[PDB]
Subunit: 326 residues, 4 copies
């Protein structure tokens, strides 16, 4: 719009929706936590850890995970908009104190890729928000199909910090201006290319691939249609790879394999949110046998296979799947 | 040391070397340009481009390349330490005005990976410094073998901003604390693992690989020794992939292939600097037929094949090479 | 209370007010302008001005353009008055909302060179009436819906009131958000600091002369008051709020109407100081009861702890004839 | 001149001086402390203090620890005197170098609450002699090798002299480097602003009373001087440098030795103002000629444009008997 900033944009979307402001507050809270995480990821205050004032305290990765988790939980609970939270970092669902209870359920991965931090890989934060439809709040309120998402997004802490957000009317991209302290709208209603020229998976699991994955990858490298082989990219940090898929097209895959027969990536707070973003941008996201968003979750840390991206590429993959299962 | 900051560390290394301060000034200048580039890469002032004060000006990639190039050139020339500069962004060598001429030659890539910027991939800045040994300065002073490097390094603008620097006594790592505006020493005398478990190349050129590359990659995925296959990673941004190789071990490759018979990566300002860092950290860097640092440059934008990393992995690759050439 | 950030706090107050979001958006817009201004004032990007890649007037103009743009693009405004513009700015019809904003985008900027604390001051009115015009900005201060100031001092602070007291927020530049640091601040009943430019002593009226005399030479055995005068209105007004005492820029022979501007300096700070339980007077009338005649009108200003202002007013009334 | 950044500028001056790098490292250490302090003063990380993840005394202590640590770890120092420490701090023998540094790490911090401009002040001496001790910090100001101040105002600025005039640098927080903004600054011969706390009028000596009278009521038909008093020494001293005039904290009946501290407030600013072509006096003696008796000794301070200080001194000499 003319709204420029994420704060004004979200407020205005909430006015158009005729919201009571409960979701707008939840979204403000999440975005504030994301700003705080960006600052920490970029290492503001590092000199103090290394003894600049005479005090040396040097698991850094574990600390940043705890801090990022603590930022998101405290910001969300203090919004007065939540009843249940599921975090990648916590074994059990976290039930909001009765005094601060609202309507919404949030599933999130506060710092995805933090294992990679030591090599300074792009990392990110992923979230999905549901309405508690349902008696007293419990983990069951977080076990809703991805079709029920009200809002979802991710933050990528890369060369710059970016947020992808959808509330159901397409995908909008915002970049953090650190001099201002605000996210700025840079692309409205982003759409993925119908077909790409990049494929993204860990080919070190080639020995463990099903026949479908083997066939598909072989055709990316050795096409049978006279075209140039696809380029390969795999950062190993899910948000970086998914975001590149969104902006450049192509396909990203973490399929089941012999060692991970149900996949690796987590349904509630990795795969559902990114599937929603990708579908909202005109792409496809599949387990290989059904849309990610149609999977009925059985457990809050359930794993699923994930294949997503440009619709023509995901279709070509699904073709290999059907053919090799027949 | 106790030096804590890069500024004090470099000064003190220059006092121990008994330098006149000319190289210390050159290094201060480069690091200042790197700080300025980090700020721009992270998008400080973006809101002003998008019309916050009423003024909208929205090729952004080309601009950031020009700015990064302009930062490095002006900072280096104004140091009074340089006579010749070679930049990735300029066709010809840039000869320093006589009034500002010093002793050193600098080869640099001011913003490597900038093509990827739109997907927020990690990007970096790479440099190598030589002494003009040699009549009037010309591009010939930049055509020295990598064995003649006096200092070299890279900046990685990733989840945080980091500098790897060597002046010939090993590799030291520094992280930018943005709240302070200084680089902080985080690891002194870093050494690469003797053997890793990650291989990093673009397997989309598989159709174009020589027999050696094909054999090596097949053995990473299908080992013949009872071990687990290697993991694959390839960001497609050279500094990100090289830095991960340094900190985690393994191998990174951009070999010659049918479409790029001399390689893709540039000898003077990509491959020489990273080969020097990697060798200073106890690794190996080869063209496949000789050490990168022994290649005698013929032209300032010459390409070379590059294979580098943990010594046992690079040896295993060189074995495939020798065997398949025999 | 739990809300922590100014964005959440303002939003929650709007929800409590049962607002449509129009004022909330306007406040969000102003606060974004203020963050942009703080960054420029602290000199972000200065190295680029000094040729790394090969003016007080410019910063005045930038700050003015920041505020005008953010406010117009809120869709919440119909009329703006700026210190920097001769005439009122009437918002394009497509972007029109119901609020009128009077502001000084960078107060104190003539003294930028000495790095003195400087600030941004604003007051918001609901338009009453009829096609928009200057007259819509000529409401008395009693009609203010919201007002506040940003001080760019050792840290950046905002003081804001929407009619329920004064709240103080500090910018955390690492987060890029204002954090609530004090709720419902109250000025001391009586302070121990007086603040005016005594370099105009030669031109003071008798009441002012008498009052300053009493501060330095008290007759009741109390310690004399300390003196402070930064010469930057927001810094002096803010110090008076937090420490107490009195701030004065009265009329003098050389400035017979006073110096400070009613619409976008005096009314806003008066509103804050009264919301905090202080007094704000021209020496004739409460500031907030002055009926404005012109958009750049000047008035005298005496404000602060109520007991100190009442003393001043006793001196004025006494010397009247 | 071409050097742009303070780090390059200081390094180049050390190369011109044919230094071994010891002083350069010390300056680098101090400037790093100052950047760390500016960031804390602007309240980076405040949201974490207010519970986002679930004190003026603390900032005094942090600033003090920043400076002590950076200076000790330079390997350039043998003795430090801080405003914050009773006793001199003797550097561990392993880290000892030849310089003695007297500093106020956060001057003005008692008034942090009102967000007043505040600063950091330092002076550096070469040790003369013999095992290190307090006595090594009791050199007169004439022996200063380098001195300066950081002002944390609307922007962060450093004023530095190493004996060749005064240079001014501004922090670009986007780059994290100080940028040269003025070389070899010279104070005006005569200014138009006087700066003191006239709340002590009741306790002034006759010379001070007479002088202030002349500023407000000149007898030669000139306009009276304007008054400014921030109450923060670095802000008032810096304004006097850039705009001219006079700054006074003389002895009075209540503070008979004066208030400001010789080693780490008065000597450093005197050194800067004299290097800029101004005067700095106790009213008895130039500050820089005072032979210090004790590390926390107090002295009167009058400084600024030379023509204005000489007028003050004429008033002092005149009223002596
Ligand atoms: N800021 C917003 N942006 C987009 N949709 C919104 C917003 N606020 C509310 N909505 C929609 O309105 C519904 C109810 O809002 P609420 O009353 O805030 O719970 C949400 O569940 C959304 O579907
Ligand atoms: N800051 C430094 N760190 C490491 N080595 C240095 C430094 N300064 C100088 N040297 C070494 O001393 C040589 C001459 O220094 P220069 O007189 O500064 O040209 C360099 O070419 C280096 O080999
Ligand atoms: N964010 C807010 N904080 C405090 N009061 C508000 C807020 N928003 C609205 N109000 C009150 O409700 C009125 C109507 O708001 P609006 O419907 O946005 O024009 C305003 O003029 C205020 O008096
Ligand atoms: N960075 C510098 N800037 C200006 N003068 C300096 C600098 N470094 C050293 N000097 C002068 O040379 C002397 C010796 O320096 P040093 O050898 O480092 O102790 C100092 O006491 C100064 O008078």
């Amino acid at each position: 719009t003319d709204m420029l900033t994420l704060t004004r944009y979200v407020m205005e979307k909430g006015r158009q929706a005729k919201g009571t402001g409960e979701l707008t507050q939840l979204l403000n809270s999440m975005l504030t936590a994301i700003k705080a995480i960006s600052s920490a990821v970029r290492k503001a205050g590092l000199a103090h850890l290394y003894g600049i004032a005479g005090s040396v305290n040097v698991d850094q990765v574990k600390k940043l995970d705890v801090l990022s988790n603590s930022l998101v939980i405290n910001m969300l609970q203090s919004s007065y908009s939540t009843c249940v939270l599921v975090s990648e970092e916590n074994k059990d669902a976290i039930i909001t104190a009765k005094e601060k209870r609202g309507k919404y359920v949030v599933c999130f991965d506060p710092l995805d890729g933090s294992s990679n931090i030591d090599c300074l890989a792009s990392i990110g934060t992923i979230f999905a928000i549901y309405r508690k439809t349902s008696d007293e709040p419990s983990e069951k309120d977080a076990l809703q199909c991805g079709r029920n998402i009200v809002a979802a997004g991710y933050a990528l802490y890369g060369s710059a910090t970016l947020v992808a957000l959808s509330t159901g009317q397409g995908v909008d991209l915002f970049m953090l201006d650190p001099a201002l302290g605000e996210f700025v709208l840079v692309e409205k209603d982003v759409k993925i290319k119908k077909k790409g020229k990049i494929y993204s998976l860990n080919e070190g699991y080639a020995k463990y691939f099903d026949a479908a994955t083997t066939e598909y990858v072989q055709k990316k490298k050795f096409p049978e249609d006279g075209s140039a082989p696809y380029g390969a990219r795999y950062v190993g940090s899910m948000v970086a790879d998914v975001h590149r898929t969104l902006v450049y097209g192509g396909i990203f895959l973490y399929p089941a394999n012999q060692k991970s027969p149900k996949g690796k990536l987590r349904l509630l707070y990795e795969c559902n949110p990114v599937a929603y973003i990708i579908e909202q941008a005109g792409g496809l996201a599949t387990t290989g046998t059904q849309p990610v968003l149609d999977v009925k979750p059985e457990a809050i840390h359930q794993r699923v296979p994930l294949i997503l991206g440009s619709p023509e590429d995901v279709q070509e993959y699904l073709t290999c799947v059907q053919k090799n299962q027949a």
